[PDB]
Amino acid sequence: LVPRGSNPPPPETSNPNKPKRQTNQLQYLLRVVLKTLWKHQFAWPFQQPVDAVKLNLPDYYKIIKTPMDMGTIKKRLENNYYWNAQECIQDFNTMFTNCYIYNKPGDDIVLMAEALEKLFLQKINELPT
Ligand SMILES: CCN1C(=O)c2cccc3c(S(=O)(=O)NCC4CCN(C(C)=O)CC4)ccc1c23
Structure with a gap:
């Protein structure tokens, strides 16, 4: 009687067909940029996929097509x-x-x-x- 929503599988994180091409910019993005953003006081709501059910955002995945x-x-x-x-x-x-x-x-x-x-x-x- 009250819609509660439902969650998709989380986005894909591996591509096994692609070669391992490491770059300085990608290393920097992981070791500096991502790490710095992660530890910011405001980061926590952005650290994991939105749980539409537990966060009581029952239309989240109706509106957001590319989480x-x-x-x-x-x-x-x-x-x-x-x-x-x-x-x-x-x-x-x-x-x-x-x-x-x-x-x-x-x-x-x-x-x-x-x-x-x-x-x-x-x-x-x-x-x-
Ligand atoms: C970033 C993904 N995301 C949303 O878009 C979103 C909308 C509404 C609430 C919410 C939440 S939440 O945990 O229900 N509420 C976030 C609030 C919790 C209270 N705040 C602080 C700083 O303590 C402000 C941010 C997490 C992640 C979300 C959202």
């Missing part, structure tokens, strides 16, 4: 899922914009996302060659 979270990004970096830094940056962008899409501009969670995004853009300015 993304920092735990998924961390695994993708660890597993060498990304071909380049741009792909990883795109996933951070998807994570922040999903928050802006689902929520209202004045919401606390949006202030948190904006702060993380500003820090992320600062850290991406410091990427290696």
Whole structure:
């Protein structure tokens, strides 16, 4: 009588068909950018996939078609899922914009996302060659 929602499987984090191509920029994204964002005071709501049921967001996956979270990004970096830094940056962008899409501009969670995004853009300015 009250819809409670339901969760998808989490996004894929490995691509076994792809060669292991390590780069300085991807190393930096894992060891500096991701780690720095992870430890920020506002990071915790973004560290794992949204649980629409336990968070009482029963329409979350109706609205958000491409979910993304920092735990998924961390695994993708660890597993060498990304071909380049741009792909990883795109996933951070998807994570922040999903928050802006689902929520209202004045919401606390949006202030948190904006702060993380500003820090992320600062850290991406410091990427290696
Ligand atoms: C980032 C994924 N995400 C959402 O988009 C979202 C919307 C509404 C609540 C919520 C939550 S939540 O844990 O239910 N509420 C987040 C609040 C919890 C209270 N706050 C703090 C700093 O202690 C502000 C952030 C987690 C992750 C979410 C959301």
